[PDB]
Design a protein around this nucleic acid. Structure first.
Ligand code: FES
Ligand code: K
Ligand code: K
Ligand code: MG
Ligand code: MG
Ligand code: MG
Ligand code: MG
Ligand code: MG
Ligand code: MG
Ligand code: MG
Ligand code: MG
Ligand code: ZN
Lengths: 38, 175, 46, 156, 222, 162, 8, 101, 82
RNA sequence: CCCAUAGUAGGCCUAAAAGCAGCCACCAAUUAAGAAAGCGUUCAAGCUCAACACCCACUACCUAAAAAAUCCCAAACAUAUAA
């Protein structure tokens, strides 16, 4: 992923989800939009 | 799919802009110009005609033809050869409401307005909005006395634009 | 003031009540009266 | 230290929401709807299935050759008008995307054959000559001979 | 029938000839020679100038004290002039150009030997002052985006506001002072020197009333 | 309550919905002016994770929470019950509301650790290797801040961090 | 059979 | 329509929806017809037919789905939502498609 | 190379006949008819600028089209900066 | 969530400028849909948003992190009436 202190969606297919105690951003269309809460 | 573009009557060319479009589809480019030029033969050459091309899964085409654009009708009806560069600030041409009625009585025969089954009033109110985009002004009464005065003053304006326009070209060379 | 709902497609024909009176009234009249009515009817309908 | 009310305001009955004057467009649709049911006598309620914008304009154009209009009104404006009216039993039809096929003269036979091309377009019901009907009633009124002949049936 | 609403009309608004922000120079026209003291009380406490709107309707509000150098002015200028529509917007400066000289000694020198030489100039800012004022045929939602982007890069706590939000902000604070259920306030105690509390306070605390600590402003304090 | 069933006969599948007996609210509520079932019965600030008779009325057969537009709860109380149900499952107080296991699954034997007042999901919690100094201690959360306004009968208020 | 101040 | 169009009516042969409009339990069935009769779904398989037969016999509504394999799916919508009917409809599409191939 | 066909310039001719109307080569120009023969609604049209919102009738479709068109313009301005 | 037809490729500039390089206008068909707010095309195509219809998404718009070197660092605790 990419560790970010301020998560932000970069397209319409990005979706927020809370896992393992922290927020993530996943995207199946563009896997480079993936972010991890720091 | 469907391809729709504006094509001059009797002047279809195998090259661009329409050539490369048909190439991607794989449709025969020469057959189009053959059929089209032979179908628009009765129509005067150089008139823009909206064309809609229907493509079948076997790269077979059945062209579709429409009536000329409103811009052609309005320009011709006014004598103007070229629309205004700026609208609302200068008047390029001048036509009547009688022309607009003879232009809607023939423009309402096209696929678009016909399939809607609208009255001729709704078409005349759409052609006055396109005339404004051109700069043309729609007047109720227009006698040849004042149509020859405005037409005479329009050339004065056109001549001035050449001087200003040509002045910029000469300045560009000095740069 | 509220039109009656449509009768079911499988239900037996339920004829309207207002006409039931008309059906009976025609039987009471005499043919000569019915005939006179009819001559005016045919012309009125044309 | 912010004040704390003894009872949370949400737990208490909220005051009724202030009324709001009806929009001008609403009181315009009602005037057009009334005209529809009053002016023309044949009214067929159909379901506005998701036909393509072209296949939905081509059909509407065919319905015009025979002088059959295709009106569309919102169900929230067309339900109240029916709740207080003669046509109070047409209410259950208006659930979802619907439209009105209306004509001053009933040309049912001419509309049905146009609706048979699309098997997934259902003619739910109608109201002819202030008489409510189902679909199967439209199929019969279509097969029923013209009125002038029926006028002659008794004469004959 | 989704209910539509009227829209505000800005036809009555006029746009100046130079809507963009003018350029700010590093130093004043004539360089200063007399060196000045630090005078830190120019960024301490509430502001008594440029606290109200003059021409525009949206601005950047300062929620703390600080000094602005040239680097800050360029960031505000470029960011605003790039992100704004010159035709329907205009912006102006509510702060003067850097005038306060800041001395600095050369690297490696020990304490003493006099005072340093003028290095750069700054502009002192107090809390409650408007830094940039914007206006024109635009709503606040349009400018609020890039104005906050600018406000976040300033050396003090700032925030974009409008004639409405600013007014509401002030009225909400007055409401808090009135409905406060706590019978004990900083003002009452300090002014009466209850508990001998003025032995740990400052004379400025009689006027700031606990809402200010150095250059920092605390809006949640009543 | 509604149920759905599928019956396969002669390679043909049939799906039906059948209504079932539905429970009815008890009559004569103490506070008929209440807006949600909680204030109508004077239960606001008076329930905890261990009051399962109350919590079972707002969950599904498999342990899931019910929507707020169905139960009629207020967002403030729906969030409390949603958190008290999470802590009841973790404490083992809802053993008949377990998740549905697909055909052919036998849960493995896992260390049985008794716990209560568990705010966070066990697997998503990392150990505190560095407690920190007395003024910046890393506390262990116990309970929920959503239940902080609950009726306390003691002089010491609810401690939420150990 | 519930008074105004009854709590289950 | 979007979720059902990505899948496609490939194995399907015919779909028939019957309901009584005047009855007060046909909202689900009429909503199911609104999506299946969409240009997105119908386009996936032109051969696949979609029929709507209206009735006024006071009978319950049903959705009968004929597949190419010969299997049939029936959903009685009086006490079923459109989403439930659509979901079950999709699941069978996926199963029957895999069986054929 | 492709150009619009040449248009005549003769005041008397333009007012008498509509030049662009006829497009066929074998056909003839369309002469304008007198005023009485044209319909009645053709000389009450809006030659000038569009009617403002304050001039229209609230209970009219043309009033809400203008109001809906102004809110689409607003949605676009607000979204542009985003 | 849902859905998208048309005067028209508006005019001018331009090799080309087709809602989206720039300047001008920003009117109008249809119950309803900007002479186009965001991607995109060499230009076009093409995907969304604002529209109608359907009917309750019937939200918040007040804060976003953390790492050093001998070995973490009292032990523990949410519910019996403020002493
Ligand atoms: S507790 Fe009173 S509204 Fe939910
Ligand atoms: K800052
Ligand atoms: K362009
Ligand atoms: Mg419109
Ligand atoms: Mg257009
Ligand atoms: Mg053009
Ligand atoms: Mg353009
Ligand atoms: Mg396009
Ligand atoms: Mg472009
Ligand atoms: Mg523009
Ligand atoms: Mg939309
Ligand atoms: Zn993405």
């Amino acid at each position: 992923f990419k560790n970010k202190t301020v998560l932000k969606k970069r397209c319409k297919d990005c979706y927020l989800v809370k896992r393992r105690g922290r927020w993530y951003v996943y995207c199946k269309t563009h896997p480079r939009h993936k972010q991890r809460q720091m | 799919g469907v391809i729709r573009a504006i094509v001059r009557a009797g002047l279809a060319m195998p090259g661009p802009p329409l050539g490369p479009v048909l190439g991607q589809r794989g449709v025969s480019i020469n057959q189009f110009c053959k059929e089209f030029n032979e179908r628009t033969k009765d129509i005067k050459e150089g008139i823009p005609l909206p064309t809609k091309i229907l493509v079948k899964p076997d790269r077979t085409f059945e062209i579709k033809i429409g009536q000329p654009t409103v811009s052609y009708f309005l320009k011709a009806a006014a004598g103007i050869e070229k629309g205004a560069r700026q609208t609302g600030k200068e008047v390029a041409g001048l036509v009547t409401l009688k022309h607009v009625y003879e232009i809607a009585r023939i423009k309402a025969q096209d696929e678009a307005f016909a399939l809607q089954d609208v009255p001729l009033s709704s078409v005349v109110r759409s052609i006055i909005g396109s005339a404004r985009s051109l700069g043309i002004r729609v007047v109720k009464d227009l006698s040849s006395e004042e149509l020859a005065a405005f037409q005479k003053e329009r050339a004065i304006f056109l001549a001035a634009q050449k001087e200003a326009d040509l002045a910029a070209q000469e300045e560009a060379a000095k740069k | 003031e509220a039109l009656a709902g449509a009768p079911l497609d499988n239900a037996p024909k339920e004829y309207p009540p207002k006409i039931q009176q008309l059906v009976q009234d025609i039987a009471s009249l005499t043919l000569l009266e019915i005939s006179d009515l009819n001559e005016l009817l045919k012309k009125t309908l044309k | 230290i912010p004040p704390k009310p003894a009872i949370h305001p949400s737990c208490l009955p909220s005051p009724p929401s202030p009324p709001q004057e009806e929009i001008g467009l609403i009181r315009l649709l009602r005037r057009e709807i009334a005209a529809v049911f009053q002016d023309n006598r044949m009214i067929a309620v159909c379901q506005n299935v998701a036909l393509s914008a072209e296949d939905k304009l081509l059909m509407r154009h065919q319905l015009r050759k025979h002088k059959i209009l295709m009106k569309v009104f919102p169900n929230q404006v067309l339900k109240p008008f029916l709740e207080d009216s003669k046509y109070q039993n047409l209410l259950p039809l208006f659930v979802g995307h619907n439209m009105l096929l209306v004509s001053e003269e009933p040309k049912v036979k001419e509309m049905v054959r146009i609706l048979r091309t699309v098997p997934f377009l259902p003619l739910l019901g109608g109201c002819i000559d202030d008489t409510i009907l189902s679909r199967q009633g439209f199929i019969n009124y279509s097969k029923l001979p013209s009125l002038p002949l029926v006028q002659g049936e008794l004469v004959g | 029938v989704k209910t539509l609403l009227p829209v505000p009309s800005f036809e009555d608004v006029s746009i100046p000839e130079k809507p963009k922000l003018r350029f700010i120079e590093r130093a004043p026209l004539v360089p200063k020679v007399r060196r000045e003291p630090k005078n830190l009380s120019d960024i301490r406490g509430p502001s008594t100038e440029a606290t109200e709107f003059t021409e525009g309707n949206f601005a950047i509000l300062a929620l703390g004290g600080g000094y602005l150098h040239w680097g800050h002015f360029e960031m505000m200028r470029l960011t605003i002039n790039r992100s704004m529509d010159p035709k329907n917007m205009f912006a102006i400066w509510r702060v003067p150009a850097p005038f306060k000289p800041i001395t600095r000694k050369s690297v490696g020198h020990r304490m003493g030997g006099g005072k340093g030489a003028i290095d750069h100039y700054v502009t002192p800012v107090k809390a409650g002052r408007l830094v940039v004022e914007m206006g024109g045929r635009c709503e606040f939602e349009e400018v609020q985006g890039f104005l906050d982007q600018v406000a976040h890069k300033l050396p003090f706590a700032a925030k974009a506001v409008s004639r409405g939000t600013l007014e509401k902000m002030r009225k909400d604070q007055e409401e808090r002072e009135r409905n406060n259920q706590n019978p004990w306030t900083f003002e009452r105690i300090a002014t009466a020197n209850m508990l001998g509390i003025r032995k740990v306070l400052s004379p400025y605390d009689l006027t700031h009333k606990g809402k200010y600590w150095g250059k920092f402003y605390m809006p949640k304090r009543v | 309550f509604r149920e759905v069933v599928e019956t396969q006969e002669g390679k043909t599948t049939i799906i039906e919905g059948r209504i079932t007996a539905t429970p009815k609210e008890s009559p004569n509520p103490p506070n008929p002016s209440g807006q949600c079932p909680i204030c109508r019965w004077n239960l606001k600030h008076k329930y905890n994770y261990d009051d399962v008779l109350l919590l079972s009325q707002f969950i599904r057969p498999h342990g899931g929470m019910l929507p707020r537009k169905i139960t009629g709860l207020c967002q403030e109380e729906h969030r409390k019950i949603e958190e008290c149900v999470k802590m009841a499952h973790r404490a083992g107080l809802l053993p008949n509301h377990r998740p549905r296991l697909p055909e052919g699954v036998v849960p493995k034997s896992k260390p049985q650790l008794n716990r209560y007042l568990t705010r966070w999901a066990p697997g998503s919690v990392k150990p505190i290797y560095k407690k920190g100094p007395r003024w910046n201690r890393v506390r262990m959360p116990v309970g929920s801040p959503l239940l902080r306004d609950n009726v306390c009968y003691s002089r010491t208020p609810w401690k939420l961090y150990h | 059979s519930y008074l105004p101040g009854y709590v289950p | 329509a979007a979720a059902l169009a990505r899948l496609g009516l490939r194995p399907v042969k015919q779909v028939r929806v019957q309901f009584c409009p005047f009855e007060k339990n046909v909202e689900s069935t009429r909503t199911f017809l609104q999506t299946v009769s969409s240009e997105k779904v119908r386009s996936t398989n032109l051969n696949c037919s979609v029929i709507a037969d209206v009735r006024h016999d006071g009978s319950e509504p049903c959705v009968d789905v004929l597949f190419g394999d010969g299997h049939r799916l029936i959903m009685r919508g009086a006490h079923l939502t459109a989403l439930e009917m659509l979901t079950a409809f999709a699941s069978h599409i996926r199963a029957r498609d895999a069986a054929g191939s | 190379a492709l150009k619009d066909p040449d248009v005549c310039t003769d005041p008397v001719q333009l007012t008498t006949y509509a030049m662009g109307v006829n497009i066929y080569k074998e056909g003839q120009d369309v002469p304008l008819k007198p005023d009485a023969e044209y319909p009645e609604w053709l000389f009450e049209m809006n030659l000038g600028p569009p009617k403002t919102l304050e001039e229209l009738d609230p209970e009219s479709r043309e009033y809400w089209r203008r109001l809906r068109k102004q809110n689409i313009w607003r949605h676009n301005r607000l979204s542009k900066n985003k």
